[PDB]
Design a protein around this ligand. Sequence first.
Ligand SMILES: [Cl-]
Ligand SMILES: [Cl-]
Ligand SMILES: [Cl-]
Length: 451
Amino acid sequence: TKPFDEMFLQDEVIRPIYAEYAAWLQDVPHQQLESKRQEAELLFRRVGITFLIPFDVVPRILSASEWARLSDGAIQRVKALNMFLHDVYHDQEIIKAGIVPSSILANAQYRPEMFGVDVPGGVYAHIAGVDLVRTGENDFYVLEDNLRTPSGVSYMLENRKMMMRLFPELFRRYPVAPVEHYPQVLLNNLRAVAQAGVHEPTVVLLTPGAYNSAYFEHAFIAQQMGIELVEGQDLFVRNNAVYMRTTEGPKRVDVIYRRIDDDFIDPLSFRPDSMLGVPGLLSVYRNGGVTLANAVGTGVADDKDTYIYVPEMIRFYLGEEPILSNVPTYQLSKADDLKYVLDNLAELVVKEVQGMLVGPAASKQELEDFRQRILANPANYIAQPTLALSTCPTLVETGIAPRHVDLRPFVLSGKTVSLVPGALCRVALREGSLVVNSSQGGGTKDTWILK
Ligand SMILES: [Cl-]
Ligand SMILES: [Cl-]
Ligand SMILES: [Cl-]
């Protein structure tokens, strides 16, 4: 019993989807792609790379039918999440029906400033990141939802550009769907959420600035879109409108793609010490003078305590059964969950909200150590059963060996809900590791969606 591999079947048989890649790999002149060392030599000789997050040249390939199911599943989930957000800030029908407890209103991410506020098209999460894992041929799990300021598209776009630059001949052998139109699809969706009356909306990207880890992505996506990259001080509010400062005079801003947290957008309504925001911005948004994307108060839908109700949102709002499954998740802030987790620690995966323990890959000492770490602050942890995480062929020291991967596509909601046929794929390079996170042996791959 081994974890499902994307390339190699039950025996050493190659899955039909990877046959053409295996053929190309055999024709590769000399020992150029036989192991991690030869891959690192190829990447340096051609593109001058020295391992910045590591990159693996073996793509994560998905068929047109796998993506169609995955894509239907992600759109269904995001529609229910947006309908949930409209509901919590309006009639709260799901709470009155007893499906979601009223304790959700104790969540710090629930913004009473958004109660009764109508947002253009009822869209709260204009961009939604969905973290997915595979366990079988037709088995996918949603690990987490990302509805605040989702990131990673720059790695998705650059990884494709890198693969096309290194191996153009490989793109001739596979019918790979393109991804580079993402910024223009996003810009078109932002224009569509302009307030009622606005004919040719002005769109800007509000950034915290250079001293932010994702700043390059902010500058990159704004440049790819062809819109102004602004900081708080570049904008100002007056008479229910937001203006951008220009030498020729103030230019009205209709839509702001915010890459700043709610807490920092308006010192007159939230954190008063913030220098990232725009004073009075929340009032203009609440009174229909501007659109913020993503909306203020989306955090209540992707919080660890709300995650468990997502399958029930799909049934309640859409009258459908969930296409994608949630992962059973324990919230160590709950006494029943804390009791269970500490009693079955060697069988579970424990993660901090805002460190990670792999119970089956831990000794009695490190298990007892983590037990103390948990009890020092239990509310900062969640736990899930250890899943049979799918492996993708990855170039390692010994050669081409299976390594654990995860997938992040980006759902876009404007007047329509859609996905560009691509995703950020993260790989856990170290043997036996399930840490796809770049902090401890984590890298990226290009994700190919076949036409
Ligand atoms: Cl961000
Ligand atoms: Cl369920
Ligand atoms: Cl739609």
